[PDB]
Design a binder for this molecule. Structure first.
Ligand SMILES: [Mg+2]
Ligand SMILES: [Mg+2]
Ligand SMILES: [Mg+2]
Ligand SMILES: [Mg+2]
Ligand SMILES: [Mg+2]
Ligand SMILES: [Mg+2]
Ligand SMILES: [Mg+2]
Ligand SMILES: [Mg+2]
Ligand SMILES: [Mg+2]
Ligand SMILES: [Mg+2]
Ligand SMILES: [Mg+2]
Ligand SMILES: [Mg+2]
Ligand SMILES: [Mg+2]
Ligand SMILES: [Mg+2]
Ligand SMILES: [Mg+2]
Ligand SMILES: [Mg+2]
Ligand SMILES: [Mg+2]
Ligand SMILES: [Mg+2]
Ligand SMILES: [Mg+2]
Ligand SMILES: [Mg+2]
Ligand SMILES: [Mg+2]
Ligand SMILES: [Mg+2]
Ligand SMILES: [Mg+2]
Ligand SMILES: [Mg+2]
Ligand SMILES: [Mg+2]
Ligand SMILES: [Mg+2]
Ligand SMILES: [Mg+2]
Ligand SMILES: [Mg+2]
Ligand SMILES: [Mg+2]
Ligand SMILES: [Mg+2]
Ligand SMILES: [Mg+2]
Ligand SMILES: [Mg+2]
Ligand SMILES: [Mg+2]
Ligand SMILES: [Mg+2]
Ligand SMILES: [Mg+2]
Ligand SMILES: [Mg+2]
Ligand SMILES: [Mg+2]
Ligand SMILES: [Mg+2]
Ligand SMILES: [Mg+2]
Ligand SMILES: [Mg+2]
Ligand SMILES: [Mg+2]
Ligand SMILES: [Mg+2]
Ligand SMILES: [Mg+2]
Ligand SMILES: [Mg+2]
Ligand SMILES: [Mg+2]
Ligand SMILES: [Mg+2]
Ligand SMILES: [Mg+2]
Ligand SMILES: [Mg+2]
Ligand SMILES: [Mg+2]
Ligand SMILES: [Mg+2]
Ligand SMILES: [Mg+2]
Ligand SMILES: [Mg+2]
Ligand SMILES: [Mg+2]
Ligand SMILES: [Mg+2]
Ligand SMILES: [Mg+2]
Ligand SMILES: [Mg+2]
Ligand SMILES: [Mg+2]
Ligand SMILES: [Mg+2]
Ligand SMILES: [Mg+2]
Ligand SMILES: [Mg+2]
Ligand SMILES: [Mg+2]
Ligand SMILES: [Mg+2]
Ligand SMILES: [Mg+2]
Ligand SMILES: [Mg+2]
Ligand SMILES: [Mg+2]
Ligand SMILES: [Mg+2]
Ligand SMILES: [Mg+2]
Ligand SMILES: [Mg+2]
Ligand SMILES: [Mg+2]
Ligand SMILES: [Mg+2]
Ligand SMILES: [Mg+2]
Ligand SMILES: [Mg+2]
Ligand SMILES: [Mg+2]
Ligand SMILES: [Mg+2]
Ligand SMILES: [Mg+2]
Ligand SMILES: [Mg+2]
Ligand SMILES: [Mg+2]
Ligand SMILES: [Mg+2]
Ligand SMILES: [Mg+2]
Ligand SMILES: [Mg+2]
Ligand SMILES: [Mg+2]
Ligand SMILES: [Mg+2]
Ligand SMILES: [Mg+2]
Ligand SMILES: [Mg+2]
Ligand SMILES: [Mg+2]
Ligand SMILES: [Mg+2]
Ligand SMILES: [Mg+2]
Ligand SMILES: [Mg+2]
Ligand SMILES: [Mg+2]
Ligand SMILES: [Mg+2]
Ligand SMILES: [Mg+2]
Ligand SMILES: [Mg+2]
Ligand SMILES: [Mg+2]
Ligand SMILES: [Mg+2]
Ligand SMILES: [Mg+2]
Ligand SMILES: [Mg+2]
Ligand SMILES: [Mg+2]
Ligand SMILES: [Mg+2]
Ligand SMILES: [Mg+2]
Ligand SMILES: [Mg+2]
Ligand SMILES: [Mg+2]
Ligand SMILES: [Mg+2]
Ligand SMILES: [Mg+2]
Ligand SMILES: [Mg+2]
Ligand SMILES: [Mg+2]
Ligand SMILES: [Mg+2]
Ligand SMILES: [Mg+2]
Ligand SMILES: [Mg+2]
Ligand SMILES: [Mg+2]
Ligand SMILES: [Mg+2]
Ligand SMILES: [Mg+2]
Ligand SMILES: [Mg+2]
Ligand SMILES: [Mg+2]
Ligand SMILES: [Mg+2]
Ligand SMILES: [Mg+2]
Ligand SMILES: [Mg+2]
Ligand SMILES: [Mg+2]
Ligand SMILES: [Mg+2]
Ligand SMILES: [Mg+2]
Ligand SMILES: [Mg+2]
Ligand SMILES: [Mg+2]
Ligand SMILES: [Mg+2]
Ligand SMILES: [Mg+2]
Ligand SMILES: [Mg+2]
Ligand SMILES: [Mg+2]
Ligand SMILES: [Mg+2]
Ligand SMILES: [Mg+2]
Ligand SMILES: [Mg+2]
Ligand SMILES: [Mg+2]
Ligand SMILES: [Mg+2]
Ligand SMILES: [Mg+2]
Ligand SMILES: [Mg+2]
Ligand SMILES: [Mg+2]
Ligand SMILES: [Mg+2]
Ligand SMILES: [Mg+2]
Ligand SMILES: [Mg+2]
Ligand SMILES: [Mg+2]
Ligand SMILES: [Mg+2]
Ligand SMILES: [Mg+2]
Ligand SMILES: [Mg+2]
Ligand SMILES: [Mg+2]
Ligand SMILES: [Mg+2]
Ligand SMILES: [Mg+2]
Ligand SMILES: [Mg+2]
Ligand SMILES: [Mg+2]
Ligand SMILES: [Mg+2]
Ligand SMILES: [Mg+2]
Ligand SMILES: [Mg+2]
Ligand SMILES: [Mg+2]
Ligand SMILES: [Mg+2]
Ligand SMILES: [Mg+2]
Ligand SMILES: [Mg+2]
Ligand SMILES: [Mg+2]
Ligand SMILES: [Mg+2]
Ligand SMILES: [Mg+2]
Ligand SMILES: [Mg+2]
Ligand SMILES: [Mg+2]
Ligand SMILES: [Mg+2]
Ligand SMILES: [Mg+2]
Ligand SMILES: [Mg+2]
Ligand SMILES: [Mg+2]
Ligand SMILES: [Mg+2]
Ligand SMILES: [Mg+2]
Ligand SMILES: [Mg+2]
Ligand SMILES: [Mg+2]
Ligand SMILES: [Mg+2]
Ligand SMILES: [Mg+2]
Ligand SMILES: [Mg+2]
Ligand SMILES: [Mg+2]
Ligand SMILES: [Mg+2]
Ligand SMILES: [Mg+2]
Ligand SMILES: [Mg+2]
Ligand SMILES: [Mg+2]
Ligand SMILES: [Mg+2]
Ligand SMILES: [Mg+2]
Ligand SMILES: [Mg+2]
Ligand SMILES: [Mg+2]
Ligand SMILES: [Mg+2]
Ligand SMILES: [Mg+2]
Ligand SMILES: [Mg+2]
Ligand SMILES: [Mg+2]
Ligand SMILES: [Mg+2]
Ligand SMILES: [Mg+2]
Ligand SMILES: [Mg+2]
Ligand SMILES: [Mg+2]
Ligand SMILES: [Mg+2]
Ligand SMILES: [Mg+2]
Ligand SMILES: [Mg+2]
Ligand SMILES: [Mg+2]
Ligand SMILES: [Mg+2]
Ligand SMILES: [Mg+2]
Ligand SMILES: [Mg+2]
Ligand SMILES: [Mg+2]
Ligand SMILES: [Mg+2]
Ligand SMILES: [Mg+2]
Ligand SMILES: [Mg+2]
Ligand SMILES: [Mg+2]
Ligand SMILES: [Mg+2]
Ligand SMILES: [Mg+2]
Ligand SMILES: [Mg+2]
Ligand SMILES: [Mg+2]
Ligand SMILES: [Mg+2]
Ligand SMILES: [Mg+2]
Ligand SMILES: [Mg+2]
Ligand SMILES: [Mg+2]
Ligand SMILES: [Mg+2]
Ligand SMILES: [Mg+2]
Ligand SMILES: [Mg+2]
Ligand SMILES: [Mg+2]
Ligand SMILES: [Mg+2]
Ligand SMILES: [Mg+2]
Ligand SMILES: [Mg+2]
Ligand SMILES: [Mg+2]
Ligand SMILES: [Mg+2]
Ligand SMILES: [Mg+2]
Ligand SMILES: [Mg+2]
Ligand SMILES: [Mg+2]
Ligand SMILES: [Mg+2]
Ligand SMILES: [Mg+2]
Ligand SMILES: [Mg+2]
Ligand SMILES: [Mg+2]
Ligand SMILES: [Mg+2]
Ligand SMILES: [Mg+2]
Ligand SMILES: [Mg+2]
Ligand SMILES: [Mg+2]
Ligand SMILES: [Mg+2]
Ligand SMILES: [Mg+2]
Ligand SMILES: [Mg+2]
Ligand SMILES: [Mg+2]
Ligand SMILES: [Mg+2]
Ligand SMILES: [Mg+2]
Ligand SMILES: [Mg+2]
Ligand SMILES: [Mg+2]
Ligand SMILES: [Mg+2]
Ligand SMILES: [Mg+2]
Ligand SMILES: [Mg+2]
Ligand SMILES: [Mg+2]
Ligand SMILES: [Mg+2]
Ligand SMILES: [Mg+2]
Ligand SMILES: [Mg+2]
Ligand SMILES: [Mg+2]
Ligand SMILES: [Mg+2]
Ligand SMILES: [Mg+2]
Ligand SMILES: [Mg+2]
Ligand SMILES: [Mg+2]
Ligand SMILES: [Mg+2]
Ligand SMILES: [Mg+2]
Ligand SMILES: [Mg+2]
Ligand SMILES: [Mg+2]
Ligand SMILES: [Mg+2]
Ligand SMILES: [Mg+2]
Ligand SMILES: [Mg+2]
Ligand SMILES: [Mg+2]
Ligand SMILES: [Mg+2]
Ligand SMILES: [Mg+2]
Ligand SMILES: [Mg+2]
Ligand SMILES: [Mg+2]
Ligand SMILES: [Mg+2]
Ligand SMILES: [Mg+2]
Ligand SMILES: [Mg+2]
Ligand SMILES: [Mg+2]
Ligand SMILES: [Mg+2]
Ligand SMILES: [Mg+2]
Ligand SMILES: [Mg+2]
Ligand SMILES: [Mg+2]
Ligand SMILES: [Mg+2]
Ligand SMILES: [Mg+2]
Ligand SMILES: [Mg+2]
Ligand SMILES: [Mg+2]
Ligand SMILES: [Mg+2]
Ligand SMILES: [Mg+2]
Ligand SMILES: [Mg+2]
Ligand SMILES: [Mg+2]
Ligand SMILES: [Mg+2]
Ligand SMILES: [Mg+2]
Ligand SMILES: [Mg+2]
Ligand SMILES: [Mg+2]
Ligand SMILES: [Mg+2]
Ligand SMILES: [Mg+2]
Ligand SMILES: [Mg+2]
Ligand SMILES: [Mg+2]
Ligand SMILES: [Mg+2]
Ligand SMILES: [Mg+2]
Ligand SMILES: [Mg+2]
Ligand SMILES: [Mg+2]
Ligand SMILES: [Mg+2]
Ligand SMILES: [Mg+2]
Ligand SMILES: [Mg+2]
Ligand SMILES: [Mg+2]
Ligand SMILES: [Mg+2]
Ligand SMILES: [Mg+2]
Ligand SMILES: [Mg+2]
Lengths: 97, 73
RNA sequence: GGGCCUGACUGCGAGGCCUGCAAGCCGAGCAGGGGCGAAAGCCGGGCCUAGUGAACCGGUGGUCCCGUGUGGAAGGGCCAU
RNA sequence: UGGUGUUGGCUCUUGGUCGCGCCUGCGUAGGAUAGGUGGGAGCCUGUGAACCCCCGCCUCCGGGUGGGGGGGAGGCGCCGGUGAAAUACCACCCUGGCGCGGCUGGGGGCCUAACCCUCGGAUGGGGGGACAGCGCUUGGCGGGCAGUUUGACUGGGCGGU
RNA sequence: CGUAGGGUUAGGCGGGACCUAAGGUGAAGCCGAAAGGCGUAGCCGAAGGGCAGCCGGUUAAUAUUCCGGCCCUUCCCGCAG
RNA sequence: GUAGGGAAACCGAGUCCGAACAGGGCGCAGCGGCCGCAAAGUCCGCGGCCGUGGACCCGAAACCGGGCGAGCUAGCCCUGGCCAGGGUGAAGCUGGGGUGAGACCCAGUGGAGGCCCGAACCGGUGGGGGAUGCAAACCCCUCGGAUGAGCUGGGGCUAGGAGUGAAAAGCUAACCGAGCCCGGAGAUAGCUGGUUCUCCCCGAAAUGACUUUAGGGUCAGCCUCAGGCG
RNA sequence: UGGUUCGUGGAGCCAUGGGGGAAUCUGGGCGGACCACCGCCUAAGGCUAAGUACUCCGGGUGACCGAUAGCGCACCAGUAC
RNA sequence: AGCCGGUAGCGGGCGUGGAUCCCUGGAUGUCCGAAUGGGGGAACCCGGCCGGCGGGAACGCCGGUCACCGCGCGCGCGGGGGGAACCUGGGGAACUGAAACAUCUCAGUACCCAGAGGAGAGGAAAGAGAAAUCGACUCCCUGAGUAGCGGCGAGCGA
């Protein structure tokens, strides 16, 4: 769960507050706190591969930010990309930001 | 997602017709094969541009044939 | 042993008992509204001392005090429980 | 461990929701087996009649409907009986069911294109395949471990208070 | 032990200018909030492997290290096949 | 600070409860002849006590944060070396017997082994000294393995809630049922002790209530101190 | 989930790990859940002296110490060990 | 107007012809150390290419340069490491307090990591909040320990 590639989404600190009892709104006593657990909330990240300029490129981006990549590639048609290695292609595809 | 039907396929529609399908199916099947492209704000100008370009050729062709029609007979 | 009854009252309360605090006990009497007696009067439960639980939380029913500009509303407050 | 993302295609299967074709609905009384709210004073037949027979269908045991074939032009309303409501024909929807369609809900099977693995060979082939891996959420199992508690009296503990 | 002066001589002995072992790292490249962890191929890692000297004399002391006599090992240049 | 009451709205020397204009609760105002003086009130300093700070001072067992260690010990990895000397004599083979052939048996050759004796070598049984010793684990004799699950040499790898363990919670730099150093930290300690020059003045309690209270804390009683009552 | 005074409460506002998901001034967000209404601002790029904090350091000044004090170090001190 | 530190001496020269000394600039500046051609156990071993000395080819010394990353159309630009606290961010305890203890507290505290500067952060409103108003960010006083939040306990706190 490394950082996202386009937006930079990364796991953040979080807590899980365990509760017991009957809440006040339902008429009961009230919700208590029987424990607190720190956690690292991890982003939903996959490997979206796009074949650009006859080269296979890999991207690690959140599932909600998927169309942004195809927007970058679909708009990157103005630049000449042939001859460049997939590494520098993955570099220049971020140059539109 | 909205896309433009590049090649006429079965049970989908007409070539150039706009069709909205599940995005993953197009990201794994349609777009990598070059059979479809999603509908943006730009390819609407390009699709209106090629349709209106076929209309700019058509309106010239048929009107010239009608002027020559006024010449003949 | 029988009759009629709801004072197993509301709003209060002189002062004392007890007494480290919190507390528990006694209480005539004034007003509203009431029972009974012919009347005088008597009734704030039981012949008395044990049959009990302090704050915190929420509910229930009412009250109609508050209402984050404002009018509502949420939620509290008060009362009794 | 459900649900949703990575995450798709096809078909079968029935189910929920919508647009239709639709057929079905039997108390007294009352032609026949009475769906309601509104419209109604005339509608069909060469988009071939009364009637007949060869089959479906819903059958409240009488029929309804689709009809076919022949005959080929004649019959059912308001009126009245009649009940609360009366009848042809054309609208708005119900009860329940079927045939198509929008949108969905799961399972059965098929495919491969995401995903994993693998192949001296790697824009290729092969296997698995929308499963698993992985994100969040839901509950459960949870001395494997972590932080704590496990009352005081008392000629300590036990008893007892 | 307290003071100053003198004493360790190598193409041959061990070792580097060689190789590789665990392992250390570490192009490609994988993974991780950071710091980093991992990584066929590579580099590094000796008492292991490869390597060409035996003996005597000698001084206050070093000696297969200087000297001696007698063997050898690498490279360059010359010539010849 | 001068005006308070009520939850509050709101009213106000009153206000709340209340029907009450009931009763109650809670609060309302200097000395002498405009002035002198005093005071409700405010401000600074100096001293008591209390609070928050480490809080009168010395003290842990220990919890965690990061660094340092496997030259000891424990395991394993790489590459080396070594185990004087004797005993006993498995398979196997040649010579013979056996049976129809075999199994099998005795002699020679023949040399196996978590075999024996026993030095170097690894031990640590038994007693004797040693006990401010030679030494923070020694000396003597005696004793078990001693070719194996062996001995050690070097390079190495493995660690703090982890390692390693042919298991003792044994060791991980001589004190390991949770390693050493530094830092949060001056942890905390109702508990132990000490609390430093002088004279005059008064003089306790060790009881009651309740307290996870009992060798600790609230309050009451008991002492002392300025002002006033007499 | 975290910040805010807010420990889940009537819990708004600022940022988001998860799924979805708009719109362009007639557009959007805030005024504490919410609705109506009325006031304030223009999010999804970023930049920016001044006023503030500190001490290796130069200096000046003290009812701060005068070698067990003042810093581990007034002396060859982060040195002996 | 004396000097060549400490530092006197053995034993030697210099200084009004301005030496000693203080400030400034430049030269120089072995080796190690971000180390940097390259290995590596710091001050060590070993090589590429090119220019140079010995008589120099075998051998040695000297001269310049030779690592990685990111950016710009092999050449250039830069990037790492350092420091007394003090900054922001990303991470982020416990003793203890609650006379115990788990929500609570110590507490964003220590330490951890990163980068930045002589400051940092911050910064010109989708701000505040009822005031017919106020109009950037920071710092001080005050609000007030008010508002509030809290096993509404301890304590916290705009
Ligand atoms: Mg992970
Ligand atoms: Mg972000
Ligand atoms: Mg964050
Ligand atoms: Mg927290
Ligand atoms: Mg969880
Ligand atoms: Mg929860
Ligand atoms: Mg839960
Ligand atoms: Mg729950
Ligand atoms: Mg529950
Ligand atoms: Mg339960
Ligand atoms: Mg219960
Ligand atoms: Mg809930
Ligand atoms: Mg309710
Ligand atoms: Mg809810
Ligand atoms: Mg219930
Ligand atoms: Mg916790
Ligand atoms: Mg966790
Ligand atoms: Mg290629
Ligand atoms: Mg690939
Ligand atoms: Mg990848
Ligand atoms: Mg290239
Ligand atoms: Mg652009
Ligand atoms: Mg289709
Ligand atoms: Mg092609
Ligand atoms: Mg034509
Ligand atoms: Mg013609
Ligand atoms: Mg009352
Ligand atoms: Mg009186
Ligand atoms: Mg009295
Ligand atoms: Mg009493
Ligand atoms: Mg008293
Ligand atoms: Mg209620
Ligand atoms: Mg109303
Ligand atoms: Mg209410
Ligand atoms: Mg209530
Ligand atoms: Mg869900
Ligand atoms: Mg019937
Ligand atoms: Mg109706
Ligand atoms: Mg009707
Ligand atoms: Mg009519
Ligand atoms: Mg008629
Ligand atoms: Mg019948
Ligand atoms: Mg019958
Ligand atoms: Mg149907
Ligand atoms: Mg359609
Ligand atoms: Mg399926
Ligand atoms: Mg299946
Ligand atoms: Mg299949
Ligand atoms: Mg197919
Ligand atoms: Mg198949
Ligand atoms: Mg097929
Ligand atoms: Mg894998
Ligand atoms: Mg490959
Ligand atoms: Mg492929
Ligand atoms: Mg093929
Ligand atoms: Mg399957
Ligand atoms: Mg798998
Ligand atoms: Mg993966
Ligand atoms: Mg999962
Ligand atoms: Mg949940
Ligand atoms: Mg359950
Ligand atoms: Mg759960
Ligand atoms: Mg659970
Ligand atoms: Mg459970
Ligand atoms: Mg099970
Ligand atoms: Mg346990
Ligand atoms: Mg349990
Ligand atoms: Mg745990
Ligand atoms: Mg575990
Ligand atoms: Mg924990
Ligand atoms: Mg815990
Ligand atoms: Mg208990
Ligand atoms: Mg006990
Ligand atoms: Mg006792
Ligand atoms: Mg006893
Ligand atoms: Mg006793
Ligand atoms: Mg006893
Ligand atoms: Mg006993
Ligand atoms: Mg016992
Ligand atoms: Mg015992
Ligand atoms: Mg016991
Ligand atoms: Mg007991
Ligand atoms: Mg007994
Ligand atoms: Mg008992
Ligand atoms: Mg000597
Ligand atoms: Mg020579
Ligand atoms: Mg030697
Ligand atoms: Mg030798
Ligand atoms: Mg020799
Ligand atoms: Mg050697
Ligand atoms: Mg060496
Ligand atoms: Mg060599
Ligand atoms: Mg060679
Ligand atoms: Mg080497
Ligand atoms: Mg090897
Ligand atoms: Mg290795
Ligand atoms: Mg190491
Ligand atoms: Mg490594
Ligand atoms: Mg690397
Ligand atoms: Mg390379
Ligand atoms: Mg390399
Ligand atoms: Mg390299
Ligand atoms: Mg690189
Ligand atoms: Mg490659
Ligand atoms: Mg990889
Ligand atoms: Mg992978
Ligand atoms: Mg970062
Ligand atoms: Mg680290
Ligand atoms: Mg670290
Ligand atoms: Mg590294
Ligand atoms: Mg990184
Ligand atoms: Mg790495
Ligand atoms: Mg490779
Ligand atoms: Mg090594
Ligand atoms: Mg040796
Ligand atoms: Mg040797
Ligand atoms: Mg050596
Ligand atoms: Mg050798
Ligand atoms: Mg050699
Ligand atoms: Mg030879
Ligand atoms: Mg001689
Ligand atoms: Mg001699
Ligand atoms: Mg000699
Ligand atoms: Mg000799
Ligand atoms: Mg000589
Ligand atoms: Mg000589
Ligand atoms: Mg020769
Ligand atoms: Mg050689
Ligand atoms: Mg050579
Ligand atoms: Mg009245
Ligand atoms: Mg009233
Ligand atoms: Mg009256
Ligand atoms: Mg009154
Ligand atoms: Mg009264
Ligand atoms: Mg009166
Ligand atoms: Mg009065
Ligand atoms: Mg007056
Ligand atoms: Mg007055
Ligand atoms: Mg006078
Ligand atoms: Mg006057
Ligand atoms: Mg006075
Ligand atoms: Mg007064
Ligand atoms: Mg006055
Ligand atoms: Mg003072
Ligand atoms: Mg006091
Ligand atoms: Mg004081
Ligand atoms: Mg104090
Ligand atoms: Mg310890
Ligand atoms: Mg620790
Ligand atoms: Mg740690
Ligand atoms: Mg550590
Ligand atoms: Mg280490
Ligand atoms: Mg050893
Ligand atoms: Mg190993
Ligand atoms: Mg060997
Ligand atoms: Mg060995
Ligand atoms: Mg050896
Ligand atoms: Mg032997
Ligand atoms: Mg022998
Ligand atoms: Mg023998
Ligand atoms: Mg024997
Ligand atoms: Mg023998
Ligand atoms: Mg013979
Ligand atoms: Mg014979
Ligand atoms: Mg023989
Ligand atoms: Mg023999
Ligand atoms: Mg013997
Ligand atoms: Mg020996
Ligand atoms: Mg030995
Ligand atoms: Mg022993
Ligand atoms: Mg021993
Ligand atoms: Mg002994
Ligand atoms: Mg013994
Ligand atoms: Mg002994
Ligand atoms: Mg002896
Ligand atoms: Mg002795
Ligand atoms: Mg000892
Ligand atoms: Mg002896
Ligand atoms: Mg003896
Ligand atoms: Mg012996
Ligand atoms: Mg003897
Ligand atoms: Mg003997
Ligand atoms: Mg022995
Ligand atoms: Mg033994
Ligand atoms: Mg043995
Ligand atoms: Mg062993
Ligand atoms: Mg062995
Ligand atoms: Mg060894
Ligand atoms: Mg070795
Ligand atoms: Mg060695
Ligand atoms: Mg070693
Ligand atoms: Mg090592
Ligand atoms: Mg570790
Ligand atoms: Mg380590
Ligand atoms: Mg661990
Ligand atoms: Mg120790
Ligand atoms: Mg001991
Ligand atoms: Mg001990
Ligand atoms: Mg000791
Ligand atoms: Mg008493
Ligand atoms: Mg007292
Ligand atoms: Mg007394
Ligand atoms: Mg007395
Ligand atoms: Mg923040
Ligand atoms: Mg909090
Ligand atoms: Mg919520
Ligand atoms: Mg909240
Ligand atoms: Mg941010
Ligand atoms: Mg976001
Ligand atoms: Mg989700
Ligand atoms: Mg949506
Ligand atoms: Mg506007
Ligand atoms: Mg509108
Ligand atoms: Mg809500
Ligand atoms: Mg900005
Ligand atoms: Mg500046
Ligand atoms: Mg500060
Ligand atoms: Mg300051
Ligand atoms: Mg300053
Ligand atoms: Mg300082
Ligand atoms: Mg310094
Ligand atoms: Mg300086
Ligand atoms: Mg200074
Ligand atoms: Mg200076
Ligand atoms: Mg000076
Ligand atoms: Mg100055
Ligand atoms: Mg000056
Ligand atoms: Mg000074
Ligand atoms: Mg001056
Ligand atoms: Mg001075
Ligand atoms: Mg002295
Ligand atoms: Mg200092
Ligand atoms: Mg200093
Ligand atoms: Mg001296
Ligand atoms: Mg000096
Ligand atoms: Mg020093
Ligand atoms: Mg120094
Ligand atoms: Mg001199
Ligand atoms: Mg001199
Ligand atoms: Mg000198
Ligand atoms: Mg002198
Ligand atoms: Mg002298
Ligand atoms: Mg002298
Ligand atoms: Mg002299
Ligand atoms: Mg002279
Ligand atoms: Mg050099
Ligand atoms: Mg260098
Ligand atoms: Mg160099
Ligand atoms: Mg080395
Ligand atoms: Mg080399
Ligand atoms: Mg060199
Ligand atoms: Mg080159
Ligand atoms: Mg030269
Ligand atoms: Mg020269
Ligand atoms: Mg050089
Ligand atoms: Mg050189
Ligand atoms: Mg590196
Ligand atoms: Mg890189
Ligand atoms: Mg980087
Ligand atoms: Mg450029
Ligand atoms: Mg070019
Ligand atoms: Mg080039
Ligand atoms: Mg070149
Ligand atoms: Mg150029
Ligand atoms: Mg330039
Ligand atoms: Mg140029
Ligand atoms: Mg440039
Ligand atoms: Mg960097
Ligand atoms: Mg770095
Ligand atoms: Mg640094
Ligand atoms: Mg900060
Ligand atoms: Mg931890
Ligand atoms: Mg505190
Ligand atoms: Mg305590
Ligand atoms: Mg503190
Ligand atoms: Mg915190
Ligand atoms: Mg504080
Ligand atoms: Mg910080
Ligand atoms: Mg601090
Ligand atoms: Mg960490
Ligand atoms: Mg960084
Ligand atoms: Mg940076
Ligand atoms: Mg830096
Ligand atoms: Mg400045
Ligand atoms: Mg600034
Ligand atoms: Mg801040
Ligand atoms: Mg105006
Ligand atoms: Mg204005
Ligand atoms: Mg202004
Ligand atoms: Mg100030
Ligand atoms: Mg302020
Ligand atoms: Mg706080």
């Amino acid at each position: 769960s490394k950082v996202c590639e386009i937006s930079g989404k990364r796991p953040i600190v979080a807590n899980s507050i365990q509760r017991r009892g009957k809440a006040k709104r339902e008429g009961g006593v009230g919700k208590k706190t029987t424990g607190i657990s720190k956690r690292r909330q991890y982003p939903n990240l996959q490997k979206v591969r796009v074949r650009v300029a006859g080269q296979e490129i890999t991207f690690r981006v959140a599932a909600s930010h998927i169309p942004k990549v195809y927007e970058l590639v679909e708009r990157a048609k103005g630049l000449k990309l042939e001859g460049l290695s997939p590494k520098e292609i993955k570099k220049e595809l971020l140059k539109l930001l | 997602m909205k896309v433009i039907l590049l090649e006429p396929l079965e049970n989908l529609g007409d070539v150039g017709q706009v069709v909205d399908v599940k995005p993953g199916y197009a990201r794994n099947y349609l777009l990598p094969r070059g059979l479809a492209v999603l509908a943006t704000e730009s390819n609407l100008k390009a699709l209106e541009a090629r349709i209106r370009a076929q209309a700019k050729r058509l309106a010239e062709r048929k009107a010239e044939a009608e002027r020559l029609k006024e010449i003949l007979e």
